[model samples]
Target: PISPIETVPVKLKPGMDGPKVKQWPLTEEKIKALVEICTEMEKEGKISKIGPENPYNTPVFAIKKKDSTKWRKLVDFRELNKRTQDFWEVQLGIPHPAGLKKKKSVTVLDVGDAYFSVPLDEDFRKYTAFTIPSINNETPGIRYQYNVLPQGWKGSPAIFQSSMTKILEPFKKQNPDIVIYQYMDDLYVGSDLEIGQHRTKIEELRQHLLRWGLTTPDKKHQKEPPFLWMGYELHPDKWTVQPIVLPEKDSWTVNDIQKLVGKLNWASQIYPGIKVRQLSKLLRGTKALTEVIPLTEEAELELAENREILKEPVHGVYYDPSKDLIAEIQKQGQGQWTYQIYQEPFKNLKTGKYARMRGAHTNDVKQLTEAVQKITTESIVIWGKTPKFKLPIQKETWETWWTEYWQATWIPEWEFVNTPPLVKLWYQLEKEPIVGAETFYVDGAANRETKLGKAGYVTNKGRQKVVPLTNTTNQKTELQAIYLALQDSGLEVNIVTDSQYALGIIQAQPDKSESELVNQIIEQLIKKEKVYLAWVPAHKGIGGNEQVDKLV
Candidate 1:
């Protein structure tokens, strides 16, 4: 037997056969490195020379290892990869902390050249053939083909994981106490007992791996309980995660941005309510992979902020079904929405504010319904942001001459007040709003020294009523006058007023300290077909406004 070896299958797209790259350009240093690897590869029987008669060929390149002291051979397989069909692998998300023993040491195993251990189907080796750039002469570079599955090929991970799954199958039965989780080459061997104390069992596991034609690197065995694996610092009961930052560079290619974004997204699994859309600008206008981009302040600051936040530990336990899940939806603008999912609202003990355990500037009602459908179907309670129109309401009466007064910040407990949409009627310009039955003019007056205001309305027929307002500002008095006029009017009329503040408040979504008057005004507006609210300059002696001014 060939040590329980597994061969990989080639699944390329139909009618795709043009990967004939003769040689890729490389520096003198890289050529030297490639020549060394190519010779070593042949000696080890990992690769061989393909004949010039062979059709399929791809370019090869060298990638520097993370330490930058060594180089790994990689192929420019983009064209071939584009034509390859996927070998589907089920994603084992968050590999094994939740399934771990109460308190156990984790032995992390790293298998070097895991991909190179699996041989490719003999017929498919031609597709994996790649040519290296010429080192010493102008003659065409030598074409070398792989025997085992090569690194940097699109389907290598899934194809190799298949064999490892088979290799580790028998080990699962003998050591049921130890939890084994494999993410490609990296393996986490977790057990209730310390792996160091059970050296015989580990040796058995190593021998089993060798029997399956695979080996873990001796120096790479980590016997620590809390090991940093898969970018998370995993402990006995908890795991810590940190966001990734792209290497500091002046101009980063599009590929680099995408790679870093994907790495950082892995951290978001534990850190709930993380605002990720803030960095969406990185992918906003990206048209091609070749294009390089300069770093933006928005992205840089967000990266720093996410890094600073990792100082705190993030916890994720099994869900308690009795508790209610709160879904928080946010938006920076009208274009789209950012949805933040959370377990429940946690009242911050120090800040005394409800933290989203977890909208539209966007007028997207569809987003609400779609999210509600996905989360659950009991009864959805949604509270949205109503637009607040800020109008400069002058609170002074005729007493502006003698009494020196200033407006204070009206910090009323306003958010608690639920003001529903009240205006059912219409408003527009002076000439026409409702194709009029009559022109009704309204005005409000306050005694200069008394601080008391009165509201009045008039029509072409004469005066309606001199309504005395109780504990009101000049703006309130003006609002009440318009309310009274709309209340008494027919189906439609033209109401001219001197207060733009009243007009602004009339059309806005209802929520105010003076919501009583606002409610009454909206009631009348709802009844009438269409009522025009036109603004006129005050004290200019308009006959109707003057009459109301005189009466009030």
Candidate 2:
């Protein structure tokens, strides 16, 4: 007997509005396919015929596969998404590829039609109804709603993950020794045991799957060494993990960058120091742009560096500590390095609370010991390090090498160099308008009573939304002023501001107040060919600066 997991009701937040129906125009071939699919679904009791008027409706279309003749039904649910409250899925972290470091064999389990396997709540299914073509082109088209959980729903993945987790929990408790790694529908059972031993475990896992009413295809169960798992190749002998070669291309688009960045981000945790953050920077300015933003020279160089970093294996060592204190060693660039992990007070961004995070530090023996004492000896991890290779001698003598090294390394006056520098690039206001560059002047002021921020720009075309602020700090006001200016400016623009904090956020770090808003402004600017963040001295009798200051 087959059973489906009942989905929860679709909940909307207060003051939200449901979207109007959007029925798509379908081709004759697509229309025929839709009718056939709905007919079969009706027979199977997975859908039902509906009347003409429903409060909510979404468009339906066919999505064709790249290599296959078949097409899959796709629904556009964006309108419904707007009506519902935003929900963030709880992500169970992906298994690091290093977990399978010396595994001899592995078995993979693919859950078939994972989303469809979970049923929808009977009351909520009506919201998913879409119209199919009429018998001929002239007659009225029929409407049908899915009985089971459908793809393209806003909360589908979260519901599926929760449902799948419920089915897999019992087996996990029963088989404590076996390593089980799951990514939504894909499950990998890995072991260092012999082939016969691994086969027996696979059989047991299969029985559990059968008991839970889950199905896996026969051919997908087979697996081997240079196996591709979560976009990174897990090698048996090589030990090092590398990204799967993306199909070669001379030109790239916004979508291409998005696809590759998504893949690289997933693999970033496993492949240490791959700099997924930098790749994200490359993609920042591409929002709302249609055409390809050809990869720049700097972006290409960064990609080359990232590709090289992937080739190096992450190093780790196992040390059994006596009395709960463990020690590990690593070599890098002609220097002996020791690494240790301990718990420390850290802020978790999600919770906004200080909690114990596993902290690792190198070469600070005293500090490491203090950390170990607080967290206790049991909380430590041993990891490998790349050997530090040093040259035997310089073109100058080794003594000269040591002297130059000390000079380069030591700078007491520049202690604040690590701290963000104040803007020193004050410029006189040009008498003439800058040609081809959209110019904007921004100013922000905060008083005991209120906070006000304003941007003044002359524009043939621009976007400006009035930002409301209450008890806003100086930094927040400063950022808000610059943000609106950038949002209103064209792709290539010159923004003149007196706030060093705003300039700092744009140039170097965005870890300050209103960072998210600042990042959004930066992202908008990135879509352009050039952006100039010029400084204007505040209250210094410059016409443009004086004008903006008066507005604030």
Candidate 3:
């Protein structure tokens, strides 16, 4: 059995008054149930009789517990809450999953009927008063309220959590060998102690909690491996922990979206690499807490993808990828490379540096081979965006490196053709281009002393800006024009430039600063999905091209 302690008063913002509320309607059966429950509560000294003259009175309603389907009385303090200010202290943070997995076993302690253990202060009990209907027409309605800490109040959880923390502080200091984690009323103890030692520690902790008027039921005293804590499975066999996924529906409302996002926000702390930004798009334009909005097709697709991402586990082990004599490297279509390196078992060698071959293709493999050959033969040191594996200055090493480590596949060259007038006209006439699909025409002009770049779009909208160049060159001005147009708009753009030389530099591997600009432009364009770059003959009869040419 659990014993009640002195009341823990609810703290309110200074200089505020509690508001009064009237009685709510109830059926005869409900009234009888409430009267019986209130009588039991009073007999147990959990509540006291109060008079109608009290300044504040809160209405009461009955709600059923989901698991048990048992009815419990709840107080509605909305009116009192409006007049009185409620403050919530910052909550304690949870340990990361990686930190918890290092232990062999964990124990969980649950306090029975946890909220009823704390009594409400005498002064604050008046604010929680509620009236019950008369058993007969001749009898008057009875007024009663909770002397114990009420479970349904807005500040109940915070108050209970804070009180439990203080109650368990002494036990923590006395038993330094036991690890205790308090999340509200439930307590968790993690340790690597053997059975004999673990049992002794548990007994010590149990007695200490008893001294503080806290009791754990016999069923709650069990200990085991791989317990569930904080919505994660804490098993000793695996190094990483994964998040549990909730059921999904074909469509969700605004409150549903909020609930899902709120849960995901907590899960993301332990499940690294979650695509939370994409999920957050569903919350845009939600103006109120209860505003119910249906899920759109785009949002549904994103939600599905986000659920898949959450299934990935956060790694707790570390691996180093260097020291072995052999390695394999592959580059993706988006210019990112994946490497799998073989490492010797017990060597302590540092990892070697990797050089990225930007925009390298099969046609350029000969140049890549030559670069490696130069390093092996003449001991030439290569720098700045180089190959992943290093080569020794020996013919045998070079042959083996080329045969085992380096490989390339043929990628077809992209040919440029001018956009037909009809297609260009259609693009110009679009009323609402796709959200990220707005198109613009870019061009540049250079005449010995001055270089200027300009972009022209639909509705005669145009942008003109001066370009700074060491020397006034048409190709340099043309490249600058495109760079200025990109400007991180995060939009898919269609750019037209008459300089075939500039386009060639953009397509091939960039070896210098001017060529690097093309690489950066392609990188941004790839992130924005597909972008179109076409070449039109200088001084051609295309109307949009002619207009942009004039702006240059």
Candidate 3 residue pairs in clash (backbone atoms < 3 Å):
7-119, 355-386
lDDT of 1 by residue, 3-41 (tens): 347576676888877477656477768887888988898
Q: State the weakest 10-residue window (summed lDDT) of model 1.
A: 348-357
Cα error, residue 411 of model 2, in Å, equals 23
**C-alpha-based local distance difference test score of model 1:** 0.59
lDDT of 2 by residue, 1-552 (tens): 123554666666677655567665667677777777777768766677877675456787866766787667777887776666555566545544332344566677776465665666677676777767664655567678877666777666776667677776777787666677666566777776676888887777777666654556758454766566565565543333354444436676767777766655444433433444344456767473445767777567657766785556453222222222222212111111222221111210000001112222111222222222332222211222211111112222323322432223211111111112221111122324457786776667666455543434333334223455675777677777777777766666677778876774565422122245765665565554556776777777355766667655
Q: Give the per-residue lDDT digits (tens) of candidate 3, residues 1-552.
A: 224454556655577766577765666667777777788778866777876675467787765655684567777777766654464654545554432324555667776456665656667777777777675563467678777666666666666666676776777787676677766656777666865676667667777667655566757354544455666555543333335565577556667777786676555433432333335456766475656656766566656765676665443321222222322223221222222222332321111112233343322233334433332222112111122342222333234334533354221221222321100100111123344454455666676555443332221234544444555566656776666665534455566666677565544423223244655655555455445665677676356667657765
**lDDT (0-100) at residue 543 of candidate 2?**
59
Instruction: Measure candidate 3: CA RMSD.
Output: 16.3
Candidate 2 residues lying further than 4 Å off, grouped into runs, are 1-6, 15-19, 52-55, 65-67, 98-104, 135-139, 191-194, 200-204, 211-213, 220-222, 235-239, 244-552
TM-score per model over all chains? 0.51, 0.49, 0.52
Candidate 3 residue spans exceeding 4 A from truth: 1-9, 65-70, 81-85, 136-138, 220-225, 236-551
Error of 1 at 339 (Å): 14
lDDT of 3: 0.52
